[PDB]
């Protein structure tokens, strides 16, 4: 099938509503990977960091996988759409489309 | 035996002539509490003098007693000859001959200022001033060729053929690695790091020491710095701050290849050399390419010898295969040279005895020595 890439684990769709906060989250096989998250082909989320977005990485010991995680907090129906998460490193390359949906 | 010591930008080098290695190496700075200090019992040392400034650096507000291959003050001088004569020498100056080493093209004030200091504050039956590009070709151990001599204050050329010098051809450059120190400072302020003081500066200069090196080619470390990897390390200071690199460490030493980044109409070391060969005789120039010599502390970062290799190379007729030689420990060979230079038969003779000084006057050392 397609080469193992970076996630051992690929993000899930979720969707929750206004002053909802959802996370979403990606796990890398093992230096320390390096995390991308986008909201499109050009868009960079860690960026757009704030009130409603916020970035959080952890390494897990005894699987020595790296879990990266995008926190939304309180999200609203702006917010509803697709998000793309793009992770590069030194040997491995891949990335995964996800939606989240956030009603009024 | 005989003393050699080193009068150069920042570190003052000093020992015994006919040792391999010097007995006192540590910085030539002065440093005194700015702020008023805070705490019980403190000594409240007012001045530090030599490496102990550099533990205590953030506090102190460092100054260099020579600036330019100049010195902007004399009694700091003192302390720091004092330090090496009676400190880690151990030996008194009335012993043995001294011997300085000055750099090609330096200004008349500085040899008759600095021998009238010797021959008065420190009294010696005799002494003698070298010339850095002489002395390292001794190192080198080689009778013809052209040497670049690059210090901590200004890189000079001085090629040299069987003994015989050619004072037209003998170029001076301005550009140096404490010059790159402050576009290095200059630089950090746009990434969002700022050093505005004398004692972090030196913090700076301690980062392009190790962690800095000279890329094979400048565009395309650039482009890969997009996604970098093993181009980022990270440097912890004695206050406990924190320091990350990137692209930023390979581009301060390309300064030196590339004077176009620093705004300067000067050419860079690799044509700067050229240009010293241009002025030298024709015969002699075949043998100039390949017995080129590296030296100086601006010199250490690797891979410098295989770019201006390949640099020379291609600019240069390649009907001649062209040799660098880069040995380790260069910055040091300045001083090296001194005490090798001391220990020749021939040069004890050569030395400015007091009673010339007396008689003729302090402008005699140009008459007397190159």
């Known amino acids: 099938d397609d080469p193992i890439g970076l996630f051992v684990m690929r993000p899930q769709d979720g969707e929750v509503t206004v002053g909802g906060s959802i996370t979403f989250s990606a796990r890398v096989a093992g230096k320390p990977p390096v995390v991308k998250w986008f909201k499109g082909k050009w868009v960079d989320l860690s960026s757009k960091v704030g009130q409603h977005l916020q970035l959080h990485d952890s390494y897990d010991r005894a699987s020595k996988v790296y879990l990266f995680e995008l926190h939304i907090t309180d999200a609203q129906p702006a917010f509803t759409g697709s998000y793309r998460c793009e992770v590069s490193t030194k040997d491995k390359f891949d990335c995964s489309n996800f939606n989240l949906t956030v009603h009024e | 035996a005989a003393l050699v010591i080193d009068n150069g930008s920042g570190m003052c080098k000093a020992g015994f002539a006919g040792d391999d290695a010097p007995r006192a190496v540590f910085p030539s700075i002065v440093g005194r509490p700015r702020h008023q200090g805070v705490?019980?019992?403190?000594?409240?040392?007012?001045?530090?003098?030599?490496?102990?400034?550099?533990?205590?650096?953030?506090?102190?507000?460092?100054?260099?007693?020579?600036?330019?291959?100049?010195?902007?003050?004399?009694?700091?001088?003192?302390?720091?000859?004092?330090?090496?004569?009676?400190?880690?020498?151990?030996?008194?100056?009335?012993?043995?001959?001294v011997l300085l080493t000055e750099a090609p093209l330096n200004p008349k004030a500085n040899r008759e200022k600095m021998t009238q200091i010797m021959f008065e504050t420190f009294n010696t039956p005799a002494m003698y001033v070298a010339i850095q590009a002489v002395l390292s070709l001794y190192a080198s151990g080689r009778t013809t060729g052209i040497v670049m001599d690059s210090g901590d204050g200004v890189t000079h050329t001085v090629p040299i053929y069987e003994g015989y010098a050619l004072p037209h051809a003998i170029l001076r450059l301005d550009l140096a690695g404490r010059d790159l120190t402050d576009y290095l400072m200059k630089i950090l302020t746009e990434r969002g790091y700022s050093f505005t003081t004398t004692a972090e500066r030196e913090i700076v200069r301690d980062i392009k020491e190790k962690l800095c090196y000279v890329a094979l080619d400048f565009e395309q470390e650039m482009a890969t710095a997009?996604?970098?990897?093993?181009?980022?390390?990270?440097?912890?200071?004695?206050?406990?701050?924190?320091?990350?690199?990137?692209?930023?460490?390979?581009?301060?030493?390309?300064?030196?290849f590339q004077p176009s980044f620093l705004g300067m109409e000067s050419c860079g070391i690799h044509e700067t050399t050229f240009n010293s060969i241009m002025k030298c005789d024709v015969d002699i120039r075949k043998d100039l390419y390949a017995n080129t010599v590296l030296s100086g502390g601006t010199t250490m970062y690797p891979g410098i010898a295989d770019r201006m290799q390949k640099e020379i190379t291609a600019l240069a007729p390649s009907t001649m295969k062209i040799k660098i030689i880069a040995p380790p420990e260069r910055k040091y060979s300045v001083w090296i040279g001194g005490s090798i230079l001391a220990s020749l038969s021939t040069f004890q003779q050569m030395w400015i005895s007091k009673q010339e000084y007396d008689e003729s006057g302090p402008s005699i050392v140009h008459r007397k020595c190159f």
């Open chain 2, 226 to 256: 997009a996604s970098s990897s093993s181009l980022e390390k990270s440097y912890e200071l004695p206050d406990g701050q924190v320091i990350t690199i990137g692209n930023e460490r390979f581009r301060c030493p390309e300064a030196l």
């Open chain 2, 39 to 97: 705490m019980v019992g403190m000594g409240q040392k007012d001045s530090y003098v030599g490496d102990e400034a550099q533990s205590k650096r953030g506090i102190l507000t460092l100054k260099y007693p020579i600036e330019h291959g100049i010195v902007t003050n004399w009694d700091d001088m003192e302390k720091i000859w004092h330090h090496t004569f009676y400190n880690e020498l151990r030996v008194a100056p009335e012993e043995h001959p």
